[PDB]
């Protein structure tokens, strides 16, 4: 069946927004970095590796606002043993109603696709914020593209997107504004 259960009472009337993790909200690496925001131990083949995570500028303000404007859902092509701890440390305000990982993506011709139709929401009221266009090849008309982030601390894309999301949260059909 569907990836998500019915939307909770207070969320039922909100637009559902799937938010990507890597290169969208944070950037991680196995190469030690002094200014990492999070260091997370990830076990692979019995060996514990340390992953250094950097937060994208304004992500906290971004997640807090989005959390109250939409029914936010984390959808990533990364493994839970990596992404679950990051989301635990990152999402302080419980903006994420659900979290979906690699196993929930559809592997289609070399790419892990975020197939929005498996979500179980009315696509007229669903949006995806992902840095990789290949992620939403099945629903390019629900996409609110955002540039890939790695470490540019001068980035302000998340901050500047809020006005747009503020407007979308009001419409009753995202296609009406996203062309479809």
């Amino acid at each position: 069946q569907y990836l998500l259960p019915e939307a909770k009472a207070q969320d039922s009337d909100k637009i559902c927004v799937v938010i990507n993790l890597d290169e969208t909200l944070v950037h991680s690496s196995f190469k030690p970095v002094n200014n990492a925001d999070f260091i997370i131990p990830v076990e692979i083949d019995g060996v514990v590796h340390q992953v250094y995570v950097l937060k994208r500028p304004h992500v906290d303000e971004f997640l807090q606002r989005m959390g109250e404007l939409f029914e936010c859902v984390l959808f990533t092509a990364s493994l839970a043993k990596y992404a679950d701890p990051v989301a635990d440390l990152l999402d302080k305000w419980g903006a994420f109603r659900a979290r979906l990982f690699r196993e929930s993506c559809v592997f289609h011709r070399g790419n892990y696709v975020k197939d929005l139709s498996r979500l179980g929401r009315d696509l007229r009221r669903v949006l995806i914020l992902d840095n990789s266009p290949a992620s939403y090849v099945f629903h390019p008309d629900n996409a609110v593209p955002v540039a890939s982030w790695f470490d540019n601390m001068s980035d302000t894309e998340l901050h500047d997107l809020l006005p747009f999301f503020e407007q979308l949260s009001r419409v009753d059909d995202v296609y009406s504004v996203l062309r479809q």
Binding site: I44, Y82, Y112, S132
Partner: peptide, 5 residues
């Protein structure tokens, strides 16, 4: 790969 491919 643990992160997004």
């Amino acid at each position: 790969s643990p992160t997004s491919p």
